[PDB]
Write a protein that holds these residues in place. Structure first.
Motif, PDB file in Angstrom:
ATOM      1  N   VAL A   1      19.333 -21.973  13.714  1.00 20.64           N
ATOM      2  CA  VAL A   1      18.041 -22.793  13.783  1.00 20.64           C
ATOM      3  C   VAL A   1      18.751 -24.262  13.495  1.00 20.64           C
ATOM      4  O   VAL A   1      18.908 -24.250  12.059  1.00 20.64           O
ATOM      5  CB  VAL A   1      16.966 -22.248  12.902  1.00 20.64           C
ATOM      6  N   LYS A   2      18.376 -25.129  14.158  1.00 16.46           N
ATOM      7  CA  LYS A   2      18.590 -26.509  13.687  1.00 16.46           C
ATOM      8  C   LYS A   2      17.218 -27.110  13.359  1.00 16.46           C
ATOM      9  O   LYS A   2      16.407 -27.324  14.287  1.00 16.46           O
ATOM     10  CB  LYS A   2      19.092 -27.368  14.882  1.00 16.46           C
ATOM     11  N   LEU A   3      16.824 -27.244  12.183  1.00 20.88           N
ATOM     12  CA  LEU A   3      15.658 -27.736  11.461  1.00 20.88           C
ATOM     13  C   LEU A   3      15.465 -29.091  11.622  1.00 20.88           C
ATOM     14  O   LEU A   3      16.451 -29.931  11.496  1.00 20.88           O
ATOM     15  CB  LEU A   3      15.625 -27.168  10.130  1.00 20.88           C
ATOM     16  N   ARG A   4      14.445 -29.500  12.081  1.00 19.81           N
ATOM     17  CA  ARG A   4      14.094 -30.916  12.290  1.00 19.81           C
ATOM     18  C   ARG A   4      13.648 -31.564  10.889  1.00 19.81           C
ATOM     19  O   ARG A   4      12.736 -31.082  10.418  1.00 19.81           O
ATOM     20  CB  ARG A   4      13.149 -31.312  13.452  1.00 19.81           C
ATOM     21  N   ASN A   5      14.404 -32.873  10.504  1.00 18.25           N
ATOM     22  CA  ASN A   5      14.091 -33.598   9.168  1.00 18.25           C
ATOM     23  C   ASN A   5      15.089 -32.476   8.275  1.00 18.25           C
ATOM     24  O   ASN A   5      14.458 -31.526   7.825  1.00 18.25           O
ATOM     25  CB  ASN A   5      12.822 -33.624   8.809  1.00 18.25           C
ATOM     26  N   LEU A   6      16.197 -33.417   8.044  1.00 19.72           N
ATOM     27  CA  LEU A   6      17.108 -32.926   6.893  1.00 19.72           C
ATOM     28  C   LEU A   6      16.539 -32.189   5.705  1.00 19.72           C
ATOM     29  O   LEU A   6      15.425 -32.682   5.243  1.00 19.72           O
ATOM     30  CB  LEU A   6      18.157 -33.925   6.780  1.00 19.72           C
ATOM     31  N   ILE A   7      17.170 -31.348   5.266  1.00 19.92           N
ATOM     32  CA  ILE A   7      16.847 -30.495   4.014  1.00 19.92           C
ATOM     33  C   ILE A   7      17.549 -30.584   2.859  1.00 19.92           C
ATOM     34  O   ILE A   7      18.705 -31.269   3.037  1.00 19.92           O
ATOM     35  CB  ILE A   7      16.236 -29.074   4.219  1.00 19.92           C
ATOM     36  N   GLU A   8      17.022 -30.331   1.675  1.00 20.44           N
ATOM     37  CA  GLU A   8      17.891 -30.526   0.457  1.00 20.44           C
ATOM     38  C   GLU A   8      18.526 -29.218   0.072  1.00 20.44           C
ATOM     39  O   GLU A   8      17.725 -28.557  -0.888  1.00 20.44           O
ATOM     40  CB  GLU A   8      17.135 -31.093  -0.753  1.00 20.44           C
ATOM     41  N   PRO A   9      19.825 -28.843   0.263  1.00 15.52           N
ATOM     42  CA  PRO A   9      20.189 -27.421   0.032  1.00 15.52           C
ATOM     43  C   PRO A   9      20.315 -27.247  -1.408  1.00 15.52           C
ATOM     44  O   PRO A   9      20.086 -26.052  -1.954  1.00 15.52           O
ATOM     45  CB  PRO A   9      21.523 -27.437   0.777  1.00 15.52           C
ATOM     46  N   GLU A  10      20.384 -28.128  -2.166  1.00 17.08           N
ATOM     47  CA  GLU A  10      20.487 -28.159  -3.610  1.00 17.08           C
ATOM     48  C   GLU A  10      19.416 -27.680  -4.126  1.00 17.08           C
ATOM     49  O   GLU A  10      19.292 -27.026  -5.333  1.00 17.08           O
ATOM     50  CB  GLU A  10      20.767 -29.712  -4.236  1.00 17.08           C
ATOM     51  N   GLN A  11      18.298 -27.807  -3.710  1.00 14.95           N
ATOM     52  CA  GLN A  11      16.821 -27.615  -4.199  1.00 14.95           C
ATOM     53  C   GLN A  11      16.433 -26.164  -3.570  1.00 14.95           C
ATOM     54  O   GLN A  11      15.215 -25.953  -3.841  1.00 14.95           O
ATOM     55  CB  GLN A  11      15.672 -28.745  -3.919  1.00 14.95           C
ATOM     56  N   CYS A  12      17.107 -25.791  -2.460  1.00  9.24           N
ATOM     57  CA  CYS A  12      16.640 -24.599  -1.782  1.00  9.24           C
ATOM     58  C   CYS A  12      16.877 -23.059  -2.576  1.00  9.24           C
ATOM     59  O   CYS A  12      17.909 -23.045  -3.390  1.00  9.24           O
ATOM     60  CB  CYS A  12      17.228 -24.527  -0.528  1.00  9.24           C
ATOM     61  N   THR A  13      15.898 -22.320  -2.337  1.00  8.72           N
ATOM     62  CA  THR A  13      15.931 -21.102  -3.045  1.00  8.72           C
ATOM     63  C   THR A  13      15.599 -19.927  -1.903  1.00  8.72           C
ATOM     64  O   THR A  13      14.984 -20.092  -0.847  1.00  8.72           O
ATOM     65  CB  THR A  13      14.922 -20.828  -4.177  1.00  8.72           C
ATOM     66  N   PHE A  14      15.776 -18.882  -2.305  1.00 11.71           N
ATOM     67  CA  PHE A  14      15.422 -17.727  -1.306  1.00 11.71           C
ATOM     68  C   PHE A  14      14.932 -16.724  -1.940  1.00 11.71           C
ATOM     69  O   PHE A  14      14.753 -16.580  -3.309  1.00 11.71           O
ATOM     70  CB  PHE A  14      16.871 -17.264  -0.893  1.00 11.71           C
ATOM     71  N   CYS A  15      14.165 -15.667  -1.453  1.00  8.43           N
ATOM     72  CA  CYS A  15      13.452 -14.725  -1.854  1.00  8.43           C
ATOM     73  C   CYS A  15      13.449 -13.341  -0.853  1.00  8.43           C
ATOM     74  O   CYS A  15      13.344 -13.416   0.311  1.00  8.43           O
ATOM     75  CB  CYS A  15      11.934 -15.135  -1.714  1.00  8.43           C
TER      76      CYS A  15
END
Length: 114
Positions: free
Chosen positions: A76-90
């Motif tokens: 998946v190429k998501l539009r509008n870059l994201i900040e991996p540093e702030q990302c979390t999973f569940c």
């Protein structure tokens, strides 16, 4: 299962996505019956690829050898870059929830209060 020697590109996905909050978007992908030993994620600035193996008796029986030697990826190429540093999973039992930070900002919210 030690030698995959295969890369399959998936065309069917089982997930649902929605954007929650001003800068956040949280999705949950349904990924089940997966060999977690081989389930990998390749992620960058805005795009990510999920490569893994699963067990589907109906499908695998139709092609002898398919399954434990078949490793596949969904990208998946998501539009509008994201900040991996702030990302979390569940992680749930059968589903995977992910909280994505849309730092590149979403545009147009209608009427905004100063």
């Amino acid at each position: 299962v030690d030698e995959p020697e295969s890369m399959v590109n998936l065309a069917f996905v089982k997930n649902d996505s929605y954007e929650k909050g001003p800068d956040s978007v949280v999705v949950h992908v349904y990924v089940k019956e997966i060999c977690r030993d081989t389930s990998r994620v390749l992620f960058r600035e805005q795009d990510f690829t999920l490569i893994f193996q699963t067990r589907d008796g109906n499908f695998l029986r139709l092609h002898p050898g398919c399954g434990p030697h078949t490793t596949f990826r969904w990208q998946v190429k998501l539009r509008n870059l994201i900040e991996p540093e702030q990302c979390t999973f569940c992680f749930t039992a059968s589903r995977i929830d992910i909280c994505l930070r849309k730092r590149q900002s979403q545009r147009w919210g209608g009427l905004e209060a100063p």
